[PDB]
Design an enzyme around this catalytic site. Structure first.
Site, PDB file in Angstrom:
ATOM      1  N   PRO A 138       0.829  -1.207   0.000  1.00  0.00           N
ATOM      2  CG  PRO A 138       0.110  -0.882   2.207  1.00  0.00           C
ATOM      3  CD  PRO A 138       0.862  -1.858   1.322  1.00  0.00           C
ATOM      4  CG  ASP A 139      -0.667   4.898  -1.959  1.00  0.00           C
ATOM      5  OD1 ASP A 139      -1.446   4.793  -0.992  1.00  0.00           O
ATOM      6  OD2 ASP A 139      -1.014   5.408  -3.039  1.00  0.00           O
ATOM      7  CG  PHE A 140       3.146   6.384   2.615  1.00  0.00           C
ATOM      8  CD1 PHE A 140       3.985   5.994   1.585  1.00  0.00           C
ATOM      9  CD2 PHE A 140       3.433   5.963   3.901  1.00  0.00           C
ATOM     10  CE1 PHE A 140       5.098   5.211   1.836  1.00  0.00           C
ATOM     11  CE2 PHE A 140       4.546   5.180   4.160  1.00  0.00           C
ATOM     12  CZ  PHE A 140       5.380   4.806   3.126  1.00  0.00           C
ATOM     13  NE  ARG A 141       1.760  12.266   2.404  1.00  0.00           N
ATOM     14  CZ  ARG A 141       2.908  11.629   2.588  1.00  0.00           C
ATOM     15  NH1 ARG A 141       3.333  10.710   1.741  1.00  0.00           N
ATOM     16  NH2 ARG A 141       3.645  11.917   3.656  1.00  0.00           N
ATOM     17  CD  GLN A 162       9.388  10.428  -2.552  1.00  0.00           C
ATOM     18  OE1 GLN A 162       8.986  11.282  -1.761  1.00  0.00           O
ATOM     19  NE2 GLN A 162       8.756  10.146  -3.685  1.00  0.00           N
ATOM     20  CG  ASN A 163       9.043   3.303  -3.173  1.00  0.00           C
ATOM     21  OD1 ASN A 163       8.372   4.253  -2.770  1.00  0.00           O
ATOM     22  ND2 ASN A 163       8.853   2.743  -4.360  1.00  0.00           N
ATOM     23  CG  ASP A 214       9.453  -1.152  -2.020  1.00  0.00           C
ATOM     24  OD1 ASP A 214      10.483  -1.242  -2.725  1.00  0.00           O
ATOM     25  OD2 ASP A 214       8.468  -0.456  -2.352  1.00  0.00           O
ATOM     26  CG  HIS A 274      12.246   9.033   2.118  1.00  0.00           C
ATOM     27  ND1 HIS A 274      10.917   9.228   1.819  1.00  0.00           N
ATOM     28  CD2 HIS A 274      12.842  10.244   1.994  1.00  0.00           C
ATOM     29  CE1 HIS A 274      10.716  10.499   1.522  1.00  0.00           C
ATOM     30  NE2 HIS A 274      11.867  11.138   1.621  1.00  0.00           N
TER      31      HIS A 274
HETATM   32  C1  5IA Z   1       7.986  -4.254   3.158  1.00  0.00           C
HETATM   33  C2  5IA Z   1       8.348  -2.771   2.871  1.00  0.00           C
HETATM   34  C3  5IA Z   1       7.203  -1.999   2.107  1.00  0.00           C
HETATM   35  C4  5IA Z   1       6.664  -0.645   2.726  1.00  0.00           C
HETATM   36  C5  5IA Z   1       5.740  -0.750   4.026  1.00  0.00           C
HETATM   37  C6  5IA Z   1       6.488  -0.980   5.410  1.00  0.00           C
HETATM   38  C7  5IA Z   1       5.869  -0.224   6.683  1.00  0.00           C
HETATM   39  C8  5IA Z   1       6.800   0.834   7.392  1.00  0.00           C
HETATM   40  C9  5IA Z   1       6.717   2.301   6.791  1.00  0.00           C
HETATM   41  C10 5IA Z   1       8.028   3.208   6.912  1.00  0.00           C
HETATM   42  C11 5IA Z   1       8.314   4.143   5.674  1.00  0.00           C
HETATM   43  C12 5IA Z   1       9.193   5.424   5.934  1.00  0.00           C
HETATM   44  C13 5IA Z   1       8.338   6.742   6.140  1.00  0.00           C
HETATM   45  C14 5IA Z   1       8.768   7.980   5.245  1.00  0.00           C
HETATM   46  N1  5IA Z   1       9.351   9.034   5.848  1.00  0.00           N
HETATM   47  C15 5IA Z   1       9.782  10.271   5.056  1.00  0.00           C
HETATM   48  C16 5IA Z   1      10.323  11.439   5.983  1.00  0.00           C
HETATM   49  C17 5IA Z   1      10.979  12.674   5.194  1.00  0.00           C
HETATM   50  C18 5IA Z   1      12.404  13.123   5.769  1.00  0.00           C
HETATM   51  C19 5IA Z   1      12.783  14.663   5.508  1.00  0.00           C
HETATM   52  N2  5IA Z   1      14.157  14.931   6.108  1.00  0.00           N
HETATM   53  C20 5IA Z   1      14.689  16.282   6.307  1.00  0.00           C
HETATM   54  O1  5IA Z   1      14.241  17.209   5.646  1.00  0.00           O
HETATM   55  O2  5IA Z   1      15.715  16.594   7.236  1.00  0.00           O
HETATM   56  C21 5IA Z   1      16.382  17.903   7.267  1.00  0.00           C
HETATM   57  C22 5IA Z   1      17.416  18.032   8.506  1.00  0.00           C
HETATM   58  C23 5IA Z   1      18.521  18.921   8.427  1.00  0.00           C
HETATM   59  C24 5IA Z   1      19.445  19.044   9.510  1.00  0.00           C
HETATM   60  C25 5IA Z   1      19.273  18.282  10.696  1.00  0.00           C
HETATM   61  C26 5IA Z   1      18.178  17.386  10.805  1.00  0.00           C
HETATM   62  C27 5IA Z   1      17.268  17.277   9.716  1.00  0.00           C
HETATM   63  C28 5IA Z   1      11.705  15.657   6.206  1.00  0.00           C
HETATM   64  O3  5IA Z   1      11.539  15.586   7.399  1.00  0.00           O
HETATM   65  N3  5IA Z   1      10.941  16.659   5.409  1.00  0.00           N
HETATM   66  C29 5IA Z   1       9.964  17.611   6.045  1.00  0.00           C
HETATM   67  C30 5IA Z   1      10.648  19.044   6.369  1.00  0.00           C
HETATM   68  N4  5IA Z   1       9.896  19.894   7.508  1.00  0.00           N
HETATM   69  C31 5IA Z   1       8.521  20.401   6.927  1.00  0.00           C
HETATM   70  C32 5IA Z   1       8.714  21.015   5.499  1.00  0.00           C
HETATM   71  C33 5IA Z   1       9.600  18.930   8.732  1.00  0.00           C
HETATM   72  C34 5IA Z   1      10.854  18.618   9.595  1.00  0.00           C
HETATM   73  C35 5IA Z   1      10.775  21.169   7.949  1.00  0.00           C
HETATM   74  C36 5IA Z   1       9.952  22.201   8.834  1.00  0.00           C
HETATM   75  O4  5IA Z   1       8.551   8.086   3.905  1.00  0.00           O
HETATM   76  C37 5IA Z   1       7.210   7.916   3.325  1.00  0.00           C
HETATM   77  C38 5IA Z   1       7.349   8.179   1.809  1.00  0.00           C
HETATM   78  O5  5IA Z   1       8.600   7.731   1.434  1.00  0.00           O
HETATM   79  C39 5IA Z   1       7.067   9.720   1.725  1.00  0.00           C
HETATM   80  C40 5IA Z   1       6.726  10.110   0.248  1.00  0.00           C
HETATM   81  O6  5IA Z   1       5.510   9.593  -0.076  1.00  0.00           O
HETATM   82  P1  5IA Z   1       5.244   8.935  -1.794  1.00  0.00           P
HETATM   83  O7  5IA Z   1       5.051  10.175  -2.614  1.00  0.00           O
HETATM   84  O8  5IA Z   1       6.385   8.024  -2.057  1.00  0.00           O
HETATM   85  O9  5IA Z   1       3.800   8.030  -1.666  1.00  0.00           O
HETATM   86  P2  5IA Z   1       2.216   8.638  -1.406  1.00  0.00           P
HETATM   87  O10 5IA Z   1       2.254   9.993  -0.789  1.00  0.00           O
HETATM   88  O11 5IA Z   1       1.219   7.641  -0.917  1.00  0.00           O
HETATM   89  O12 5IA Z   1       1.809   8.998  -3.109  1.00  0.00           O
HETATM   90  C41 5IA Z   1       1.957   8.034  -4.068  1.00  0.00           C
HETATM   91  C42 5IA Z   1       1.465   8.639  -5.481  1.00  0.00           C
HETATM   92  O13 5IA Z   1       1.300   7.636  -6.475  1.00  0.00           O
HETATM   93  C43 5IA Z   1      -0.060   7.488  -6.902  1.00  0.00           C
HETATM   94  N5  5IA Z   1      -0.395   6.054  -7.130  1.00  0.00           N
HETATM   95  C44 5IA Z   1      -0.611   4.997  -6.173  1.00  0.00           C
HETATM   96  N6  5IA Z   1      -0.837   3.829  -6.802  1.00  0.00           N
HETATM   97  C45 5IA Z   1      -0.765   4.064  -8.201  1.00  0.00           C
HETATM   98  C46 5IA Z   1      -0.922   3.219  -9.389  1.00  0.00           C
HETATM   99  N7  5IA Z   1      -1.208   1.830  -9.360  1.00  0.00           N
HETATM  100  N8  5IA Z   1      -0.778   3.844 -10.605  1.00  0.00           N
HETATM  101  C47 5IA Z   1      -0.497   5.214 -10.648  1.00  0.00           C
HETATM  102  N9  5IA Z   1      -0.339   6.060  -9.615  1.00  0.00           N
HETATM  103  C48 5IA Z   1      -0.483   5.457  -8.389  1.00  0.00           C
HETATM  104  C49 5IA Z   1      -1.004   8.100  -5.883  1.00  0.00           C
HETATM  105  O14 5IA Z   1      -2.207   8.540  -6.474  1.00  0.00           O
HETATM  106  C50 5IA Z   1       0.000   9.251  -5.408  1.00  0.00           C
HETATM  107  O15 5IA Z   1      -0.115  10.334  -6.262  1.00  0.00           O
HETATM  108  O16 5IA Z   1       5.971   9.926   2.618  1.00  0.00           O
HETATM  109  C51 5IA Z   1       6.026   8.933   3.589  1.00  0.00           C
HETATM  110  S1  5IA Z   1       6.320   9.668   5.228  1.00  0.00           S
END
Ligand code: 5IA
Ligand code: ZN
Length: 270
Positions: free
Chosen positions: A34-37, A107-108, A110, A127
């Site tokens: 499954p994806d996330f969003r 970003q995966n 897996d 990631h």
């Molecule tokens: C067996 C394995 C399989 C998996 C399952 C296992 C279960 C465990 C899960 C753990 C995963 C890790 C979590 C993670 N963690 C990401 C954290 C980001 C880190 C970043 N570090 C950073 O800056 O440090 C700076 C630093 C500097 C100095 C010191 C310290 C730090 C960060 O903090 N930044 C935020 C920055 N801030 C706010 C801006 C907050 C701090 C600053 C204020 O990663 C994920 C993931 O990887 C990330 C991105 O998601 P995606 O895009 O891959 O997927 P999804 O969203 O579902 O969409 C999918 C699209 O496809 C479409 N679709 C779908 N199906 C189909 C289809 N069939 N056909 C066609 N289309 C299709 C759908 O329609 C969508 O369109 O989201 C999340 S959380």
């Protein structure tokens, strides 16, 4: 302007030799992950049976320090299952075998890109990965398998030396990206084609990499929706193949005439 056939002919005529690819969880939903969003089917819609104020907290580092038990409970759900790469992963492995892949940014977590046979030097696991783990206290590294049994037995894995909570080397919200992310400073300026597959482009700083290519570089998005900077900062050479990534990749291989190469690769891998 440009179309899916235009991009295919640029690859056929070798006008695009240094392709950079960005992928997200959408490319692994055809593999059963499954994806996330995605509404309804995404993880963020199916976390009711978890002690979470809001679904994103389970992947946020501050909440992890507060209570890691919900994260390892969810980990026990996709840890036991065995997942296989799909047509999108093998398309990218064929892109590599034809010498066209500059770098694959994923970003995966897996690990399916590695399973498909793409060498780690061509991958940027932006990631992180489950293949290794690290004690959050003493920084000691451990193979990813060393915490598998603890997660299966409903236990938060703890360091065998200092008892600190051991974390798989994935990147939580609020955690810095790995060092290999800095390769974008050399990869993206040199890319002559950018492919974006199956990501919502909502997570920074990975999302902003779509803007790092030169303005003359075509950007092909194969996704369910037009997302990210491709929606609010579009460029003249942007192509959007909206719909299922399976169908869009299948269409691309046909226009490239790579059907026979794809069959040989699939038969050797599987
Ligand atoms: C067996 C394995 C399989 C998996 C399952 C296992 C279960 C465990 C899960 C753990 C995963 C890790 C979590 C993670 N963690 C990401 C954290 C980001 C880190 C970043 N570090 C950073 O800056 O440090 C700076 C630093 C500097 C100095 C010191 C310290 C730090 C960060 O903090 N930044 C935020 C920055 N801030 C706010 C801006 C907050 C701090 C600053 C204020 O990663 C994920 C993931 O990887 C990330 C991105 O998601 P995606 O895009 O891959 O997927 P999804 O969203 O579902 O969409 C999918 C699209 O496809 C479409 N679709 C779908 N199906 C189909 C289809 N069939 N056909 C066609 N289309 C299709 C759908 O329609 C969508 O369109 O989201 C999340 S959380
Ligand atoms: Zn330790």
């Amino acid at each position: 302007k440009l179309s899916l056939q235009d991009v295919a002919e640029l690859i056929r005529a070798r006008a695009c030799q240094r392709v950079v690819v960005m992928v997200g969880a959408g490319i692994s939903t055809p593999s059963g992950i499954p994806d996330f969003r995605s509404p309804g089917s995404g993880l963020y819609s199916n976390l009711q049976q978890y002690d979470l104020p809001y679904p994103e907290a389970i992947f946020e580092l501050p909440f992890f320090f507060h209570n890691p038990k919900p994260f390892f409970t969810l980990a026990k759900e996709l840890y036991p299952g065995n997942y296989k790469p799909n047509v999108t992963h093998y398309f990218l492995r064929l892109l590599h075998d034809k010498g066209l892949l500059l770098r694959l940014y994923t970003q995966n977590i897996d690990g399916l890109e590695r399973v498909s046979g793409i060498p780690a030097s061509k991958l940027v696991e932006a990631h992180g990965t489950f293949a290794s783990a690290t004690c959050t206290v003493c920084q000691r590294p451990f193979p990813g398998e060393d915490i598998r049994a603890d997660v299966m037995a409903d236990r938060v894995p703890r360091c065998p030396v200092c008892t600190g909570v051991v974390k798989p080397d994935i990147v939580f919200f609020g955690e810095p990206l790995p060092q290999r992310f800095l390769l974008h400073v050399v990869d993206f300026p040199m890319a002559d084609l950018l492919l974006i597959l199956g990501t919502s482009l909502e997570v920074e700083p990975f999302a902003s990499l779509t803007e790092a290519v030169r303005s003359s570089v075509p950007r092909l998005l194969i996704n369910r929706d037009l997302v990210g900077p491709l929606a609010w900062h579009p460029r003249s050479r942007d192509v959007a193949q909206l719909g299922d990534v399976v169908h869009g990749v299948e269409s691309l291989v046909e226009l490239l005439g790579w059907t026979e190469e794809m069959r040989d690769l699939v038969q050797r891998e599987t």
